[PDB]
Amino acid sequence: AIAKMRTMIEGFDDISHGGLPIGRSTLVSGTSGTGKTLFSIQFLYNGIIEFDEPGVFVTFEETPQDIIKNARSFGWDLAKLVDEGKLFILDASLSALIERINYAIQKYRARRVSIDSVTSVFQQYDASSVVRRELFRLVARLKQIGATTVMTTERIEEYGPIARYGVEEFVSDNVVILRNVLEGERRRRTLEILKLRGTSHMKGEYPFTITDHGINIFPLTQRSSNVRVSSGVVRLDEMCGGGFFKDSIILATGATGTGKTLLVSRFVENACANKERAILFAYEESRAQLLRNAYSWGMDFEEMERQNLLKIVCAYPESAGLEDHLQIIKSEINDFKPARIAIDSLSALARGVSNNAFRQFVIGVTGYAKQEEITGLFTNTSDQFMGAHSITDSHIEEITDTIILLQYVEIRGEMSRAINVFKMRGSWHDKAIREFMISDKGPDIKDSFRNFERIISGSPTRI
Amino acid sequence: AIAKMRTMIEGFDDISHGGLPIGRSTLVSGTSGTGKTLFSIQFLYNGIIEFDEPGVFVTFEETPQDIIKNARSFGWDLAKLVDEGKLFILDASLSALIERINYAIQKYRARRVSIDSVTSVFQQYDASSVVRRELFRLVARLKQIGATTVMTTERIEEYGPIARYGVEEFVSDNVVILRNVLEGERRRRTLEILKLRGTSHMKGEYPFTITDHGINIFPLTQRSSNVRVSSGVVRLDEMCGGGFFKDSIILATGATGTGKTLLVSRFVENACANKERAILFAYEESRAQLLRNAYSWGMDFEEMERQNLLKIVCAYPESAGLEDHLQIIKSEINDFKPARIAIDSLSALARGVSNNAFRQFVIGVTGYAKQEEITGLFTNTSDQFMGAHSITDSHIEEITDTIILLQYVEIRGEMSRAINVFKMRGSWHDKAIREFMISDKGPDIKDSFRNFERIISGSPTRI
Amino acid sequence: AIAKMRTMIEGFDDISHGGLPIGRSTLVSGTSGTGKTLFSIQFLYNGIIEFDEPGVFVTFEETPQDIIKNARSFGWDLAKLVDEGKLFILDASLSALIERINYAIQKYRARRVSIDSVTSVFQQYDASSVVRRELFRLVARLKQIGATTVMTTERIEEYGPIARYGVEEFVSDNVVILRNVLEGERRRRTLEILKLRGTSHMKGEYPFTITDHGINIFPLTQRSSNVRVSSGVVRLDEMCGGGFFKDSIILATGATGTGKTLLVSRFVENACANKERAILFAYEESRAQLLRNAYSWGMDFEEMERQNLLKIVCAYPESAGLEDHLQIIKSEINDFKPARIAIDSLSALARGVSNNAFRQFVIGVTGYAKQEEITGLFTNTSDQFMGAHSITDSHIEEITDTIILLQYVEIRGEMSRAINVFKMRGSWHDKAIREFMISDKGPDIKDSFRNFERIISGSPTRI
Ligand SMILES: Nc1ncnc2c1ncn2[C@@H]1O[C@H](COP(=O)(O)OP(=O)(O)OP(=O)(O)O)[C@@H](O)[C@H]1O
Ligand SMILES: Nc1ncnc2c1ncn2[C@@H]1O[C@H](COP(=O)(O)OP(=O)(O)OP(=O)(O)O)[C@@H](O)[C@H]1O
Ligand SMILES: Nc1ncnc2c1ncn2[C@@H]1O[C@H](COP(=O)(O)OP(=O)(O)OP(=O)(O)O)[C@@H](O)[C@H]1O
Ligand SMILES: Nc1ncnc2c1ncn2[C@@H]1O[C@H](COP(=O)(O)OP(=O)(O)OP(=O)(O)O)[C@@H](O)[C@H]1O
Ligand SMILES: Nc1ncnc2c1ncn2[C@@H]1O[C@H](COP(=O)(O)OP(=O)(O)OP(=O)(O)O)[C@@H](O)[C@H]1O
Ligand SMILES: Nc1ncnc2c1ncn2[C@@H]1O[C@H](COP(=O)(O)OP(=O)(O)OP(=O)(O)O)[C@@H](O)[C@H]1O
Ligand SMILES: [Mg+2]
Ligand SMILES: [Mg+2]
Ligand SMILES: [Mg+2]
Ligand SMILES: [Mg+2]
Ligand SMILES: [Mg+2]
Ligand SMILES: [Mg+2]
Secondary structure (H helix, E strand, C coil): CCCEECCCCECHHHHCCCCEECCCCEEEEECCCCCHHHHHHHHHHHHHHHHCCCEEEEECCCCHHHHHHHHHHHCCCHHHHHHHCCEEEEECCCHHHHHHHHHHHHHHCCCEEEECCCHHHHCCCCCHHHHHHHHHHHHHHHHHHCCEEEEEEECCCCCCCCCCCCCCCCCCCEEEEEEEEEECCEEEEEEEEEEECCCCCCCCEEEEEEECCEEEECCCCCCCCCCEECCCCHHHHHHCCCCEECCCEEEEEECCCCCHHHHHHHHHHHHHHCCCCEEEEECCCCHHHHHHHHHHCCCCHHHHHHCCCEEEEECCHHHCCHHHHHHHHHHHHHHHCCCEEEECCHHHHCCCCCHHHHHHHHHHHHHHHHHCCCEEEEEEECCCCCCCCECCCCCCCCCCCEEEEEEEEEECCEEEEEEEEEEECCCCCCCEEEEEEEECCEEEEEEECCCEECCCCCCCEEC | CCCEECCCCECHHHHCCCCEECCCCEEEEECCCCCHHHHHHHHHHHHHHHHCCCEEEEECCCCHHHHHHHHHHHCCCHHHHHHHCCEEEEECCCHHHHHHHHHHHHHHCCCEEEECCCHHHHCCCCCHHHHHHHHHHHHHHHHHHCCEEEEEEECCCCCCCCCCCCCCCCCCCEEEEEEEEEECCEEEEEEEEEEECCCCCCCCEEEEEEECCEEEECCCCCCCCCCEECCCCHHHHHHCCCCEECCCEEEEEECCCCCHHHHHHHHHHHHHHCCCCEEEEECCCCHHHHHHHHHHCCCCHHHHHHCCCEEEEECCHHHCCHHHHHHHHHHHHHHHCCCEEEECCHHHHCCCCCHHHHHHHHHHHHHHHHHCCCEEEEEEECCECCCCCECCCCCCCCCCCEEEEEEEEEECCEEEEEEEEEEECCCCCCCEEEEEEEECCEEEEEEECCCEECCCCCCCEEC | CCCEECCCCECHHHHCCCCEECCCCEEEEECCCCCHHHHHHHHHHHHHHHHCCCEEEEECCCCHHHHHHHHHHHCCCHHHHHHHCCEEEEECCCHHHHHHHHHHHHHHCCCEEEECCCHHHHCCCCCHHHHHHHHHHHHHHHHHHCCEEEEEEECCCCCCCCCCCCCCCCCCCEEEEEEEEEECCEEEEEEEEEEECCCCCCCCEEEEEEECCEEEECCCCCCCCCCEECCCCHHHHHHCCCCEECCCEEEEEECCCCCHHHHHHHHHHHHHHCCCCEEEEECCCCHHHHHHHHHHCCCCHHHHHHCCCEEEEECCHHHCCHHHHHHHHHHHHHHHCCCEEEECCHHHHCCCCCHHHHHHHHHHHHHHHHHCCCEEEEEEECCECCCCCCCCCCCCCCCCCEEEEEEEEEECCEEEEEEEEEEECCCCCCCCEEEEEEECCEEEEEEECCCEECCCCCCCEEC
């Protein structure tokens, strides 16, 4: 096996199966604005913070003052690290460069080296053979010195050659690719480990986000128990065999206006009533509209929000990508430590996105909720309000544990509502589909449609 | 006919119809990180291990120390082979190179030669005619010496020119292509024999995987008997004419929440009850959730797992490709030697993949199960819970031998379940569709819906 | 008109409408491994064998020893032809080359000349004008000498320029293109005559295969009679007005598990019972599984196979392309001389292929069966087991003469089977759809569903 230096970057050590190999060069290639400089800075910063390993950052484009000023936005005080001698910033804006880097490593006992852009040096030569030869010389000398080095290079096209000259991949022992894919006028950041000589790794592209704390890569044994939480509606708990499970994931799917937001609001209100903290992520309604609707339902969200029990986070789905929404949800969960989380609509997050990306987002959110033992209440909007046979437009049914189905039923020329417990993993539940009503006091559950047939199609026939 | 030297690489001799021709050059071309160095190392290593044939590995990019260090991750002690004189590693980091290779072949009685990258030598020349001339000289000299040589070259594009200069294919007698296709943010490794002068071979691309033992290529007369195994449910055995066949493949397809995992769990529990070893591959639920659900069904998986009778392997479908899942399943089957294997969901493995790839995966798994005389229990999730007419979204019905159909039936405003034996190859089975119930004691099978019509559509009408 | 020299290559003279023009140059262009060398060798070999016309093969890449060694795999003893003086192999690994070729033609009285690769000579020049001028000189001199010449050139892209320099097409009188198209990870060989100056030809691409006998091109007045063969089921013969026709093509289409393989097995068993030879091509089941299923049906295939009456050929559809399957079927038919041929499933061959290619394959197989007066029993699997309205997923209904329809019918909560004679060309047949049963003694045909309506949809209603 090969010893691996943990980069301590969130999620990178998972895909790399223990981190970057010790003493081997890693080349991170990407287009402008992908996060190469941030990756190289965070490598050294996390190394210094977690293991006291000195770092040397050799820069070519940005001045050291610019590097420190940019890092200050992340809370990283690189200036005090330079004063303490833990971090060194070499200015290089090839043999002499390697000699100076070696001298810096010797003087500061550096364990990690970062090279901001070797491409700027290679700009002086047009032949790819010369670039390959000089990169091989640099990598060989770095390996001989024994310092783990992370160099970054530039790309012209997202889906094309891995590097500018097409020969950098064949030289470096380790290759990592940062991509900023523009599709549907939306930008998505992806990370892909192309080649790790001598060790296994995860294969493919995984989304990552840049936040105030740096890079947060999402590298896509959950515990279970018999403790049952209360949804908030007594009939909905009786139908579920004694309420939802603590670790369960509940998905309430139905057409617009069937009462998904009402169930979400009752879930949050019941969470806060038992002195538990709850988070409500809203994507179809604003905070004031939610307050007015809750007041129409006889529920005071203002009092529970003043007590810091309920946190309502409202944003438009189009304001950020799905991975950004996942990162925001995770950050809010970490900051607030909630017992329950609810989402106003997954279909709102599903607007204008591919099925695979939405499924990945749902899998990530549900896995994080189960890992943190947080009761999650997701909701989904069906495209057709009657005659729908697919539970969800994007198949996420297998992911969830408990499913609630809300639908419209046309009876006597009136649009009544029907609610049913579609499935519950590990628990008995009522199979009947029952009439669902909404009034000033909230939701009510009535008897089932025993006298009707073809109820699922939305246009039943009395028999 | 042409004599062929067996490469002993798993699956390569099947597609090459006996191995690489003796005394002829084979050029393996691919992009960075496809497995060219691994292929060339494994060729010589397997030759030495299986036939005591000495091997010579000429390297250009990696140092011999790097080669040995990388090989050590596979358990290949190349250093002791160098000490024993069976393996030689020439360092070349063109006529002089050929003279040194010939001297190494003469001194060590080499039978196999591997060339890591002739492209690095060709980098010195830009004209494709010069590259073609020098490659022809090298191949002609290698043929004159009589050593079977495997050279590797580099590619820039996966679907484009076969080699960097576009002339390497017209020189070498044998051409093999390694591709690392990136599609849907997922990487897939493929192997394609382009041209074998003088001999037949399989045509097209076949998936291969890199594991701790090296390359495991999957090159996509099964025996039958009348011995009948027990599923675990007595009614499901009565309906099947006395249980499933030992060599049969059973596919239980239905909507979410119909009871596929219950049948899989009963299958595994009955396998382990008769002191047989069983494997359960889970993709929709974790180990703890499976344990809790089994406990809710009155089945103790913990006791049977402590006895090393049941092996539960749980992973996310998105963590690896379909060929990787097939390799993992095969490795677990080889390590555990199970009588029965069960899969929690094929549709989970079918997320975000093409129909052809999923069908190939199913064909491979079923063929391996039948070849090893292992009773396999596959399950499939239908997109629509009612009104579905296609048995499976991806047509794999022809592959399977026995099919069980689970469906939802809306009767009296309640979602009951129906189970039916769709087909059984070589055995009589009950044609009735019977009511299916789930309780604390497990599954129950009741009388059929004799009084209803259009049961298949999911919304029957009492007649 | 122009006199044409028959190349004697199987299927080439059909598309070329009598062969290559005499005294005119033909340039065959294709990528690596398409079959250019094989085409040029087979041209001279077939000329010598069939008309005693001496041939001269001028080679540039392969040595004459390599050429003979490669040809020996096809059974072509080129060495004895060189000794006899019928064949000459000139080694050239431009004016001097033409002088030597002319001397060889004069000395050996050569009538056909083949040039393995003029592209290798043209590699010395980069200007396309020089290549065009020298190729024009070569073609003009060859025409002046009066020898029919087949030169081959190289291509970089399958769908792009016809030749490397883009000027070879405008020089040569005749242009032929060999393509090796890679699509869906599958390779397909195609042949296309681009331009024949002065004569007509077939237009477009036609599949061809390379086998142990060389190139077998498939260039896509059938006789009829009133002799009626017996299917094997007496009721199925009564319904068909006295059995199938000898020259008829029968297609039995239905869902999985309806009994297509049972009908195929009964067809083969009845063929062999009357001392006729029969061939069964299996693609969904192995030989042992077929034997076990036949034994369950009371039919002993082993005894009839020992008598060399029945030949069972089993293979996976994914092991070869559709044209390869057609070639294998034709070769087996030629070797065994069968009275009847049966196919276990056309839909198995239809996996992962385009509709047009499958239709071409079906047309070819049916035309060959009708031309050879062989009774063919094809079968097709429908995607939907109920409610299907298209007879076949890929429309091949017009091709066939007799159609049998098998379907599932849900009656009284049980999945019964229905069989119907959809159509019969030139013969009266029963229009009723009758109940179909399978038991230990085989198939049984019962009364029709006179009391039901909407039987075709699979969910009838008693009236
Ligand atoms: N505090 C921050 N919060 C959020 N995003 C930030 C923050 N600081 C920087 N970024 C983002 O980091 C991205 C990458 O910045 P970086 O300096 O690493 O560029 P780069 O990938 O090295 O590019 P180049 O080589 O073209 O200079 C920028 O596009 C910017 O949007
Ligand atoms: N005071 C009230 N009395 C009766 N019904 C009410 C009252 N307030 C709201 N409703 C009902 O609430 C329904 C909408 O419920 P909800 O806010 O949960 O929406 P939803 O089903 O989640 O869909 P979406 O947010 O996409 O519109 C409306 O159709 C309306 O009939
Ligand atoms: N022990 C291992 N387990 C799993 N995968 C491994 C292991 N060792 C190496 N690999 C994989 O083998 C792949 C190919 O490695 P290899 O050294 O053969 O590269 P290559 O195809 O010759 O590339 P290049 O010519 O760019 O150097 C790497 O991308 C790596 O992911
Ligand atoms: N103790 C129990 N009593 C009654 N029913 C139960 C019990 N435990 C589970 N169930 C039933 O099991 C059903 C789900 O069964 P199972 O775990 O086999 O799922 P499945 O059909 O394979 O689908 P998926 O895993 O995709 O959700 C639920 O709908 C629920 O009604
Ligand atoms: N006995 C055989 N059986 C089956 N296929 C064969 C046999 N002999 C040769 N082939 C096939 O013939 C194909 C073409 O071989 P050939 O020597 O004609 O190459 P080519 O088209 O002239 O290529 P190039 O110009 O690159 O050398 C090979 O790819 C090989 O797979
Ligand atoms: N001994 C038997 N008794 C009764 N029915 C039998 C017997 N053996 C087989 N069958 C029936 O044969 C059916 C399958 O028939 P067959 O082998 O012809 O398949 P098919 O319709 O060609 O489809 P496929 O090969 O795609 O599964 C099964 O549904 C089963 O009910
Ligand atoms: Mg920069
Ligand atoms: Mg809402
Ligand atoms: Mg290498
Ligand atoms: Mg399940
Ligand atoms: Mg050739
Ligand atoms: Mg069959």
